[PDB]
Amino acid sequence: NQQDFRTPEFEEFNGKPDSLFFTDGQRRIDFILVYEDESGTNEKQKRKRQAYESNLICHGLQLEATRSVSDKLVFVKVHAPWEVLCTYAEIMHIKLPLKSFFNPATRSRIVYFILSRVINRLVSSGIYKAAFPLHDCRFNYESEDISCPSERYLLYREWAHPRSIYKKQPLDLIRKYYGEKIGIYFAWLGYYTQMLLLAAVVGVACFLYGYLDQDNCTWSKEVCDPDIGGQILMCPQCDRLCPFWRLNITCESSKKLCIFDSFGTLIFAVFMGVWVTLFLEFWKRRQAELEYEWDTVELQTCGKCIRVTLCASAVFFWILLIIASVIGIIVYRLSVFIVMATSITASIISHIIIMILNTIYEKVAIMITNFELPRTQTDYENSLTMKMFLFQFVNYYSSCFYIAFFKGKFVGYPGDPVYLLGKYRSEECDPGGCLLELTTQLTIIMGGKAIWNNIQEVLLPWVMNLIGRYKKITPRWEQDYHLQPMGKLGLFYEYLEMIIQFGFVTLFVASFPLAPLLALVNNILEIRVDAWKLTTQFRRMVPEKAQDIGAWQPIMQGIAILAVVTNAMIIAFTSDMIPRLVYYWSFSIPPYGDHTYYTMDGYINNTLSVFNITDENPYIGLGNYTLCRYRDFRNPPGHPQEYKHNIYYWHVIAAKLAFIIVMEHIIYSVKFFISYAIPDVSKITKSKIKR
Amino acid sequence: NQQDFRTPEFEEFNGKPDSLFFTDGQRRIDFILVYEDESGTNEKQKRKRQAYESNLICHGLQLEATRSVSDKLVFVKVHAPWEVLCTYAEIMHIKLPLKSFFNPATRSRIVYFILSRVINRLVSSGIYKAAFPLHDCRFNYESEDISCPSERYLLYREWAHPRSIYKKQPLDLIRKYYGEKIGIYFAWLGYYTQMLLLAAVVGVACFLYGYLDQDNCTWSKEVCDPDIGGQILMCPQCDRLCPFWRLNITCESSKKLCIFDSFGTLIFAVFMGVWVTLFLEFWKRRQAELEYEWDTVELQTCGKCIRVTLCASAVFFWILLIIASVIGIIVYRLSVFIVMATSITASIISHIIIMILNTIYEKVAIMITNFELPRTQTDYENSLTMKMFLFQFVNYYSSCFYIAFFKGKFVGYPGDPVYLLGKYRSEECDPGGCLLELTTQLTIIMGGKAIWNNIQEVLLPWVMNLIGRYKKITPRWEQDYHLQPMGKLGLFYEYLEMIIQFGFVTLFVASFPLAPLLALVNNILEIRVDAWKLTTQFRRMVPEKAQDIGAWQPIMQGIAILAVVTNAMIIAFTSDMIPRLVYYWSFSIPPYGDHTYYTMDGYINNTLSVFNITDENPYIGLGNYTLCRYRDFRNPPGHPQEYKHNIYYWHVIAAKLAFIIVMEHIIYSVKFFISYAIPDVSKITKSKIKR
Ligand SMILES: [Ca+2]
Ligand SMILES: [Ca+2]
Ligand SMILES: [Ca+2]
Ligand SMILES: [Ca+2]
Ligand SMILES: [Ca+2]
Ligand SMILES: [Ca+2]
């Protein structure tokens, strides 16, 4: 309880490079302590460190210290004797198998439990420079010690090196080396990859179905036809900045659309609702099986309500402010890049700004909790998880929800457009369409940002380690000291990235079916990059235990429900499928159309709405034209209700709302049945539980 | 393990009238068995019963048998000695309080558990006529024995007597006397009554709001006025059976409608969604509180899959057939009663037919499970509960779903109506409207059928007991013998009645807001009737333990979700609120209407569709009239798309679908937020859990 004496056996030896034991070699190293003290704060830190070391020795730990060969830094070796291990294995409910004994992971967990009971406070307040366990050896080389297993080398060879990309994950080795959280993260990632392979082959089937009929989609042929889709002259998209345009750029746009907008995409969206349900249910079953195999189950006012309400209101205000900022920044970045290839540059500029404001968002997300922190790890972690996920959701998915549900959805007919305010003429979608723009944005996100994110993940920790080493034989503790410490909530970031990808896959799956395939390739690379940067660059973290992914499971459930709603809204409002269907059924018939049987020909001409120049009148300056046609269902000019919504408009909007209702109800019913018909715990797992 | 000897101490004594003990008086009676044997089957029954009694004696029980004073019926008293009770309280996980000992309820439960382990099989195969515990004393009189508590007398005086209808439920006494199942049923009933009081005062406020504005609803005044609602001549409701009618019966019909069809009803529907959410959440908290207080927490292939699928298919087929039978019988009973008071007679005829087919439905619901019975009580009971509830749901709620969502919804214009087949002209709703018919049906159900059900519950057990006694001092066993035995799933029927009432309250709350009040009165009477018939009429049941209401909780969750959907559909399709709203907002304006500002005057004339006689033509025979109007939004005759749906129809249907979408999404979001914001277990309950 007092700084009676210092760390015993203060001896220096760095000759053995890959020795995890002490100088005698009898006992291994379950933790390492780092401090620099030789150069009024200095004496206070010295006294407090001496007190802490004395407490550690008195509790039963053995501390042996050495100084860095490359001086002023002193490394202290921490080991738990046999008695300490036995007594804290009796205290901490550890599921030992009863028919050296403990793998180094659980030993380091025990010693960190001891440090917490008597550790992060010293490190945070500059007292201790670092404190960590040790790796077995260098990732690329076998350990010099024959006795010590070089399982880090094995994990680098068969699991982390890109050359073994196609091999199955040794999901038992990574959990026995790193811990249950890392192991369950990688198991969840692998299962997610398998389900993505299933959804990806189904989506490729749908894509090929839409590609084989690409030569028969009548509307796309008419758009490409110069005799039908060339005669149609459209109205300018913006004010005084766009000219009158025909419908022949929409030739290529609509070929790609007919590929990406057909019955195959709707079939795939229904299948994807089913597939999300199956993914969630079978992950519940796999999670139960992993819980059994790994034994993850272990155990160890008015003013306050007013403050909670005020903080929630402040968080909501901040979220709304960031929503507006993201929408404005993407609109103004598009405007900047106006004066394709430009999309990629705009995408990377938005990515850099998003990462800057993401760092800002992390800072504000810890600040908001700073004055309301219960300091209990589980609830604080879950609250921070929810808040950070809300922020990331806001950013990433607002950039896409603006295109899907807000862009072009609230404008008017060319005569008297919807003028917002002093700066007005709110942008409408591209000539290709809102759906094609959303598809291109999702493709850019998936492909380009997955590639660049994996490259950054590979390089940034490696770059930091390289620059740290830039500024001869070194022991294990010194080598581990020159490694990036994976800070607080590091695995949280990996889970967050994968949940963002899952939201991208499921929420907007009705736009392009290749999202599961693009996520499949990304995940196949992601397993290896996350394994490699954890194995080689980042310093080894103390193992712990987790029985599930955490708040990410409720987050995924909410994303699934929101995905049903969002896919219904995408097929109804963003997509053009329902107007085509309504024409083919109830407007190519004698009461409205002229065709005898239900067909699709003469659809583009009949859908578009005329607008003659009877309206400043900025349109006459653009050209000598007199009538332009726009993507709306108003009455023709000269009608008694001209520019007002006509019978066709309300028919189509009723069909859209009816489709939303029918699809949502049927999909929710099927999801309810599948979740009901699937036992969340497998029969084999029940049988082995009975034993 | 052999029939070595009979029941010891075979003596006859009936002098003591309310003696719960044996002849000696040292030991109380924990069970009574009924058998008659003095008159090949006889000797086998004698041998089997003697073996059963010998086994009971060997296991530790003491059995004394006496014959009835009024012969051939012999009653056997069953007592558990101190050693057996102690050893089985050690066996069965009983939470005895440590700072005669056991209350007779748990003693009876233990003895019944012993009988089951070594009782129902004998009763089923005529071996034992009946097997029951005994009550302490007569309900209306004190116990003759001074020492014995007269807690049945106390329950009658304070809780079962209708004179104490305003008292609090002695919810601890009823669970300590009857058991945890009955106790939790009555606790749920009391909490349901409290929440019904809340919903009832709110609904009375909404009804008052609709009743005060009864003189300001313009459309009802127009209907009543002979100048507007009298000149409108409507088409005959049926073919060759109904005449041309004006719109003046709809005067009174619309007065009542404007009372029951107003924004107050919509506000109350939203509030009822919130109230169902709060009811479920606070019942979860109350159930946790009762689990803590009462300590209810206790513990003690291809061919098969094909058979399960076949059984599910058979169940679905039977359900559909019963749906058809119920709709056909109600339609044909209405037809019979055609050739008000007639509704009441039709209601009671339907009630009699419903009870007959309910007996048949219980028979078929046990038959379907007989050949697939796992024989484990929990799963088989849950399956039977779900199937029987599905059947009762189909009956009760299909009689109303036909009126709401199908009657008059799929018909045609009077010229060439929807002719189904050889017998055709599908019936349209009454001149008052589908909503008024639904509200009248619900009022009949609630008021008349609740009063009649309570009267039947009071009389039928009492009448059966009277006729049984029809065919001088009688001891306890003989007194209990002449009582109606609450058979299998007896408590299930009470729960089913209350859940049917809950479904009527929640699913159709958008029709009339007095449903919560009518449920409140019914439940205040129901607590007393269920207490009285259980205490005085029905024979005592063996106590059991249950920590929740059972499958009724998932059933109520499903009913809540379906009630959100059903109230949305009722307000949209069955109710006329949305057409009125659409007229007032977007059809009393210059583009369509003539009025300057938004108003509701001239709504009835503008909504109805004209139809001149240009069609057999049964309409000319009925009268000399030439044009009639009908409740549809077709084009006027002579239009280029005459009798086809017009702009008004599609605008109205789009608004109906949009309201369904918006209301469902908002209500589900609010329910999600409230269930999230409310912890399922109370804070005080958590604090006492910590102790
Ligand atoms: Ca990545
Ligand atoms: Ca990653
Ligand atoms: Ca399930
Ligand atoms: Ca009743
Ligand atoms: Ca009852
Ligand atoms: Ca809750």
Residue numbers in the entry:
A (entry chain B), B (entry chain A): 43 to 81, 89 to 119, 121 to 149, 202 to 220, 233 to 414, 446 to 484, 507 to 638, 645 to 788, ...
Sentences from the study reporting this entry:
TMEM16F, a member of the conserved TMEM16 family, plays a central role in the initiation of blood coagulation and the fusion of trophoblasts. The protein mediates passive ion and lipid transport in response to an increase in intracellular Ca2+.
We thus set out to study the mutant F518H by cryo-electron microscopy (cryo-EM) and determined structures of the Ca2+-free protein in detergent and the Ca2+-bound protein in both detergent and lipid nanodiscs. In contrast to F518HnoCa, the two structures of the Ca2+-bound mutant, determined at 2.96 Å in detergent in presence of the lipid PIP2 (F518HCa) and at 2.93 Å in lipid nanodiscs (F518HCaND), adopt conformations that are distinct from WTCa (RMSDs 2.0 Å for F518HCaND and 2.88 Å for F518HCa) with both structures carrying characteristics of an activated state. In F518HCaND, the poor resolution of the α3-α4 pair compared to the rest of the protein reflects its high mobility under the investigated conditions, whereas in F518HCa both helices are found in a single well-defined conformation. In case of α4, this leads to the straightening of the bent conformation adopted in WTCa by 16° in F518HCaND and 26° in F518HCa. The concomitant conformational change of α3 from WTCa to F518HCaND can be approximated by comparable rearrangements. Although the large 2N2-MSP nanodiscs provide a condition that is closer to a membrane environment than a detergent micelle, the accessible conformational space of the protein might be restricted by the size of the disc and the apparent destabilization of the bilayer at the site of the subunit cavity, leading to the observed conformational preference.
